[PDB]
Amino acid sequence: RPDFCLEPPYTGPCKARIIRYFYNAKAGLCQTFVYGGCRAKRNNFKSAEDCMRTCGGA
Amino acid sequence: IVGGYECKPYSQPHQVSLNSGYHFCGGSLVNENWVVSAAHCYKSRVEVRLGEHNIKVTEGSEQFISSSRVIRHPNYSSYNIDNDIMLIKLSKPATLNTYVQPVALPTSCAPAGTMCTVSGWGNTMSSTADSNKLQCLNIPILSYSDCNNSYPGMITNAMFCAGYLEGGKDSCQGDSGGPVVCNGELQGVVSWGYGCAEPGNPGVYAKVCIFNDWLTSTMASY
Ligand SMILES: [Ca+2]
């Protein structure tokens, strides 16, 4: 599992309401969060599947 | 919208909701065929919802028009959040009426101190303020000095700050693309800021008046 899967989800400075997924390592689940629309970090996926294939495990 | 108040239904007739499965951004109807929003709210195809007040309840007043074109400002930069403006062409022209009426473009750029209104269905950061019901908020345009001091080196000519350095009232996630109307003219488009309603971090808006030329030329190019 890439280390970026352990970082908190980052909304960013923009003010849109775009629903994205991020890997929640504390619960070991891919969950949704509100992404602002700019300056996305790596623990930010367009779908649960991407999130799972990427951070799902090791 | 944090620290604002529920708008009188239909008091912001130009206010639109960008939908793509759910409300993700706001926008402003500038004419029966065009809507202005933020470039960071871009999507190749979006549905524009006009005549709305409570986005989660069918009111009879609404019009769902799909876009036919979505043009981002050519010089937009996502990292700098610079030139954060875009135009959306409505597939079928909006029917102007008691609920759907356009907002005028700025003739001049508004001065610091100018009191404006911003509205949207974004986060209200309150369990009492319902974001589904259009929220309104009066905010003064801040001087470039205070703006640049809040965000050192981040403020370009395409931006201006508006709000309160004390915090408490601001636009928030879900408000992007929305309007900042100062005396009947569309002065800005909700763009970004650090957090929402935080002291020392006022909201930053795209500066519409420095775009009049692109706006008009583009709405004429087919
Ligand atoms: Ca409605």
From chain A, the residues in CB contact with B192 under 8 A are 13-15, 36, 38
**Which two structure tokens, joined as six digits, stand for B101?**
């009426």
* CA-to-CA separations, B141 to A55, B144, B186, B188, in angstroms, rounded: 44, 9, 13, 10
Helix (H) or strand (E) holding A53: helix A48-55
The CA distance from B63 to B49, in Å, is: 6
In 3D space, the residue among B108, B164, B166, B104 whose CA is nearest the CA of residue B139 turns out to be B164
Nearby residues of B14 by Cβ (< 8 Å), 6 or more positions away: B28, B29, B30, B101, B102, B103, B179, B181, B186
Q: Which of A36, A37, A39 sits opposite B79 (nearest CB)?
A: A39
The CA distance from B59 to B56, in Å, is: 9
Count of CB pairs separated by less than 8 Å, A with B = 65
Domain boundaries, chain A: 1-58
Q: In the CATH scheme, what is the homologous superfamily, with its name and number, of domain B13-102+210-222? A: Trypsin-like serine proteases (2.40.10.10)
**Which two structure tokens, joined as six digits, stand for B154?**
């981040």
Q: Does domain B1-12+103-209 have CATH number 2.40.50.140?
A: no
Which residue type is seen at A45?
Answer: F
Nearby residues of B122 by Cβ (< 8 Å), 6 or more positions away: A15, A17, B1, B26, B131, B135, B171, B172, B173, B174, B175, B176, B178, B190
The CA distance from B14 to B12, in Å, is: 6
Q: Angle B121-A40-A33 (CA atoms, 0-180°, nearest 5)?
A: 50
The CA distance from B37 to A3, in Å, is: 36
Report how this structure was experimentally obtained.
X-ray
Resolution for this experimental structure (Å): 2.1
Q: In CATH terms, are B1-12+103-209 and B13-102+210-222 the same topology?
A: yes
A21-48 burial, b at 16+ Cβ within 10 Å, e below that, comes to bbbbeeeeebeebbbbbbbbeebbbeee
B40 flagged as catalytic: yes
Which residue type is seen at B130?
Answer: D
Q: In the CATH scheme, what is the homologous superfamily, with its name and number, of domain A1-58? A: Pancreatic trypsin inhibitor Kunitz domain (4.10.410.10)
Domain boundaries, chain B: 1-12+103-209, 13-102+210-222
